Amino acid sequence: ALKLCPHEEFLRLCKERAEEIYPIKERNNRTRLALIICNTEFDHLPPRNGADFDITGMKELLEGLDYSVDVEENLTARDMESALRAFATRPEHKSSDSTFLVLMSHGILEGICGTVHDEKKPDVLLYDTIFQIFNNRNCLSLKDKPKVIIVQAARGDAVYKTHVEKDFIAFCSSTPHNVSWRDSTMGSIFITQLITCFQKYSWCCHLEEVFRKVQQSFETPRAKAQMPTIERLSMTRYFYLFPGN
């Protein structure tokens, strides 16, 4: 179960450490949005069994964190771009303090596979495209607001403009996975551990602390090969979720 931060601690932390913390909008008017894109059936790649467990767990976790969740399934890389660009113009971001993007598919080094991906003829949503669509120029509604990118994607001059890509954090599991009968039985180990660490720790620890406890659980001999990684960190503050408020 998702543990809740007391209303007392909510008021205290927000007042006493305001300069250090992403500001939270108050619950009544708040309209947080989150997006899940999950590809499970592929024209030239093996199916991803058990991904429904990951959708179910993340959707419900994000709803507990007071996000309204959209789910999109089995898109081409081009339709993933259009879905992301459409999500970025959604009016409800104006009355929100943050967003989550959850992206689940096969992966390559540079990005996320769309449904028609092939070695001959790649179909990839590049990671660089995701940050571009949501940067400080192309998505004003979310500027200065945390943009949390959750990626589950198992594998088999003029760049100084890092004034524009700010307040992102990406938490990715792109290490290979051995397909097995078990996949139809349970979700991905990354998504499972993510969910439980949000449940145990988000009431008292900020987002980066939650992520680091996730990584801690992967520090065993048989599990460290699947360790998830924090990437493209550009947060300028700590992000406390304050479950319940």
Domains of the chain with bracketed CATH: 7-231 (3.40.50.1460)
The C-alpha atoms of residue 71 and residue 148 are separated, in whole angstroms, by 16
The C-alpha atoms of residue 151 and residue 102 are separated, in whole angstroms, by 6
Resolution of the structure in the document, Å: 2.2
Cβ-in-10-Å burial (0-12, 13-18, 19+) of 16 comes to: exposed
The C-alpha atoms of residue 192 and residue 160 are separated, in whole angstroms, by 37
Asked how this structure was determined, the answer is: X-ray
Q: What is the DSSP string of 147-215?
A: EEEEEEEE--------SSS-SEEEEEE-S-----GGGGTS--HHHHHHHHHHHHHTTTS-HHHHHHHHH
CA 199 to mean position of chain CA atoms: 16
Give the H or E element holding residue 100.
strand 99-108
Residue 138: how many other CB atoms lie within 10 Å? 15
Nearest to 50 by CA among 175, 172, 152: 152
CB 168 within 8 A of CB 131: yes
- Length of the chain equals 245
**Residue 188 in tokens:** 């991905």
